[PDB]
Amino acid sequence: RIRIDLPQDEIPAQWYNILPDLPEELPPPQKEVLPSKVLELEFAKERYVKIPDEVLERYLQVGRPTPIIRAKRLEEYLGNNIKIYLKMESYTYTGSHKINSALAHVYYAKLDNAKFVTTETGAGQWGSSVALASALFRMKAHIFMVRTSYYAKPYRKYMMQMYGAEVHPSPSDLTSNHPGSLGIAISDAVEYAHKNGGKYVVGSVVNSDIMFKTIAGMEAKKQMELIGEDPDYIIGVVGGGSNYAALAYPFLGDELRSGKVRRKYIASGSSEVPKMTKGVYKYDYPDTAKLLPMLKMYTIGSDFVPPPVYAGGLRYHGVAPTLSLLISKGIVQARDYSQEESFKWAKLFSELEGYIPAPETSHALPILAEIAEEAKKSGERKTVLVSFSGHGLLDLGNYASVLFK
Amino acid sequence: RIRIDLPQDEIPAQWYNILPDLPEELPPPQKEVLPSKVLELEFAKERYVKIPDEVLERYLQVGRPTPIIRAKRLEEYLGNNIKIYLKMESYTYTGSHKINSALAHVYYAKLDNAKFVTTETGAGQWGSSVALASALFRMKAHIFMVRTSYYAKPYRKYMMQMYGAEVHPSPSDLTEFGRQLLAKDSNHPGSLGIAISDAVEYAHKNGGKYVVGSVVNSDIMFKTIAGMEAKKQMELIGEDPDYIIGVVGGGSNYAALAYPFLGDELRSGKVRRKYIASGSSEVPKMTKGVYKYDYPDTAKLLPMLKMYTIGSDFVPPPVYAGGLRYHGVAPTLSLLISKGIVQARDYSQEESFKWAKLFSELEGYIPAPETSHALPILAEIAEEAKKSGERKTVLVSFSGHGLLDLGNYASVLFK
Ligand SMILES: *Cc1c(COP(=O)(O)O)cnc(C)c1O
Ligand SMILES: *Cc1c(COP(=O)(O)O)cnc(C)c1O
Numbered sequence: 001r002i003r004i005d006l007p008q009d010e011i012p013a014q015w016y017n018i019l020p021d022l023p024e025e026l027p028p029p030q031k032e033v034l035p036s037k038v039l040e041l042e043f044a045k046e047r048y049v050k051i052p053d054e055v056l057e058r059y060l061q062v063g064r065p066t067p068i069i070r071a072k073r074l075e076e077y078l079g080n081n082i083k084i085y086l087k088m089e090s091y092t093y094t095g096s097h098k099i100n101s102a103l104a105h106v107y108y109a110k111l112d113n114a115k116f117v118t119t120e121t122g123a124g125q126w127g128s129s130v131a132l133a134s135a136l137f138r139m140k141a142h143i144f145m146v147r148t149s150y151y152a153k154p155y156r157k158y159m160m161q162m163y164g165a166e167v168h169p170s171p172s173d174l175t176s177n178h179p180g181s182l183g184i185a186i187s188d189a190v191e192y193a194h195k196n197g198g199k200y201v202v203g204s205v206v207n208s209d210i211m212f213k214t215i216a217g218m219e220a221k222k223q224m225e226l227i228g229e230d231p232d233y234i235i236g237v238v239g240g241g242s243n244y245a246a247l248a249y250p251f252l253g254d255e256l257r258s259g260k261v262r263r264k265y266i267a268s269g270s271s272e273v274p275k276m277t278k279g280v281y282k283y284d285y286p287d288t289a290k291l292l293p294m295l296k297m298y299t300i301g302s303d304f305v306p307p308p309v310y311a312g313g314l315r316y317h318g319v320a321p322t323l324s325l326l327i328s329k330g331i332v333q334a335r336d337y338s339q340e341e342s343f344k345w346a347k348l349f350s351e352l353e354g355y356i357p358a359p360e361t362s363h364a365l366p367i368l369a370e371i372a373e374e375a376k377k378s379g380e381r382k383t384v385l386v387s388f389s390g391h392g393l394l395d396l397g398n399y400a401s402v403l404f405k
Numbered sequence: 406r407i408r409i410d411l412p413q414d415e416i417p418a419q420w421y422n423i424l425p426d427l428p429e430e431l432p433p434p435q436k437e438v439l440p441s442k443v444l445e446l447e448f449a450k451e452r453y454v455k456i457p458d459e460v461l462e463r464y465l466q467v468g469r470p471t472p473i474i475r476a477k478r479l480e481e482y483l484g485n486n487i488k489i490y491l492k493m494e495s496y497t498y499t500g501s502h503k504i505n506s507a508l509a510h511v512y513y514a515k516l517d518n519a520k521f522v523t524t525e526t527g528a529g530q531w532g533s534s535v536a537l538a539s540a541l542f543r544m545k546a547h548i549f550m551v552r553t554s555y556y557a558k559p560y561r562k563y564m565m566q567m568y569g570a571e572v573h574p575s576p577s578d579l580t581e582f583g584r585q586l587l588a589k590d591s592n593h594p595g596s597l598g599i600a601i602s603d604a605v606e607y608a609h610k611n612g613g614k615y616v617v618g619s620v621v622n623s624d625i626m627f628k629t630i631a632g633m634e635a636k637k638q639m640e641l642i643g644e645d646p647d648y649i650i651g652v653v654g655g656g657s658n659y660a661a662l663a664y665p666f667l668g669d670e671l672r673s674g675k676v677r678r679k680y681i682a683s684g685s686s687e688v689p690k691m692t693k694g695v696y697k698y699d700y701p702d703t704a705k706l707l708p709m710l711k712m713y714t715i716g717s718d719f720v721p722p723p724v725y726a727g728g729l730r731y732h733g734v735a736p737t738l739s740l741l742i743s744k745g746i747v748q749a750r751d752y753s754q755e756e757s758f759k760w761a762k763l764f765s766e767l768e769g770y771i772p773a774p775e776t777s778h779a780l781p782i783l784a785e786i787a788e789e790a791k792k793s794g795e796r797k798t799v800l801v802s803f804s805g806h807g808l809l810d811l812g813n814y815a816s817v818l819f820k
Pocket of ligand 1: 095096125237238239240241242243244358360361389390391
């Protein structure tokens, strides 16, 4: 009884849409390449949206529902002051939550009779997720991978290729050895989709994309209800915020409706990319390519470039608009930790629990230490539910660059 | 309804020992450093050996029981002539079945009050599994890794290090055997036999125990937790497999799945299911091995075993990347093959990796290169099943995922 399995025939059948439940309307922003039904869901007004049959089928295909695991050996290390439950989005075939939305974007593109889909990727997480979704929907995928990552971090490129996708170093020939960047790769992929009748699958922080990922939180609420455990804290890490919102919003939405928020919601980023603790809540460009409307979000600037030493994976400059609203209203609390502190926790967690977290995920572990410290003072036990967003088996080089000389 | 989970509170509590049920008497084999219980269990005569409670607990800790997944999209591709169930040993935290043995070996080392464990490793699959097992028992681990692999295949080294193991390039300066070889070449490339000799000496001289990753009977027995689980999972959905298939490195993953089923039939007096196992035609011990006593490890130490072998000095061509490099077949499995009870196949790495890619696109999960050699068997079964007029059920030992072996695939498939 470490693992809480949800049977596949009990998988939730709807996504959760937080918009009708937000304290106040979201600041408004300030269509040829996007799947049509995706743009439409960005304004959805109903609280629950049915997961299409074909999408749910492939959720089951890629390993959903994912388990919750109780991290009892970590609990002991922390003095048994808190109980720790991990929602294991790492258990999907691509090793993260990203496939939860990649599958939906590809489904809706297929419904627009897309000839192929395109997308950008840096280190390869989003690209490999889109490559898997495309294979399962029998769709041709053209992935534009920053040339530096295309050569430095080749394994996820090989993964995309095993799934049948064509991986193009950005900038490429279709379009001397310009190392590229993520913003060029977005333009590099958005153009190829525009001039060849493809659709662009957006790897950014829109509302529809959080909604698709909320299958994780819908499952977790069922699983926690299955063992009779109501979490006092829900925590996670913020690249753009989609993985954390996906877990928390199904729980938080019911609190917002009932009037009172009882649970504590805490999210972390990297202090080398400190949008969570040093970012400013204002309109900014959600992608470094500067196309896509501006939205009001916590941000350290779409032009921010992480230090070369940074290997923690939370490189994005901003926070999803709904999550930013929640933070500015005091509903979600913010933290930031260094990669040395986080990767030290990742190593400890690997030895204690046996499972190597993604470097991104490791930034949630210092939160647990803080909650345990407050519990020791209070001194009342608390239950924490963690978005365990990925595993680290394709990121061991990141860990090595910091931990192993 | 494609995944069959076995709840953790339903995990089997004993390992299966085929020795009392083998048809013929199996060739008897031909040690301050081995755990005492490991030596004892080689010759065990009971059918079932109780899994110690501390080992069971860590089975749960590393992801057991693993799921069976039905590969419906692959069934469709193949004409819906067969049902295909995959026992997913890839779902353990180290990505393969080797942890099922490593945990037992480390526990019995702890029971002997060992100060630490040692083992050898090449590509890193065994080293990673011992490193995790050791972490979960708070056992210090010293892993002696073939020096060339130490630098060439570093990701699995990093995995060992994340688990807190100390990784020593081999030959190392920590032993006399290693220091002597470094005196001739300060950067000696090492070998698996050299790494074995390193680990054994270090254990012997410093109060540790050596954890063996080879085809001894106890090792297969420890891995039978996967077959015990799979038998319960298949019975739970009313599916009796007609074929049980897998790949052969030394044969432990396949035996671990098959033996719990095969024992029942050996006891009934007649084998009705079909058992098919495959290797690499570049390392063709399965189809072209000589059946004789041979060294189970490449620089001796362990006693000789009677097995299908192509010689412990066999080295595969440098283009080979299928991962089934080992030169022999476990002795009990060798016996079964020689009696016609298990059928042998071998496939090229081009044919197997072609199937790996197809399977990755159809089902969305990247097999280990080693595992991919089971896939060609399915096309043979689909043909046979069509002739029967019934839809036949196949159970597959899905021994690992390929995420740490994607370079291997790229060398064959992507230029
Ligand atoms: C990309 C990534 C993240 C951050 O993404 P979000 O936009 O915050 O959801 C977190 N964990 C893993 C494993 C990732 O790959
Ligand atoms: C080592 C390995 C094998 C070979 O296993 P044997 O027990 O020796 O037959 C097969 N598959 C994977 C994934 C392996 O790592």
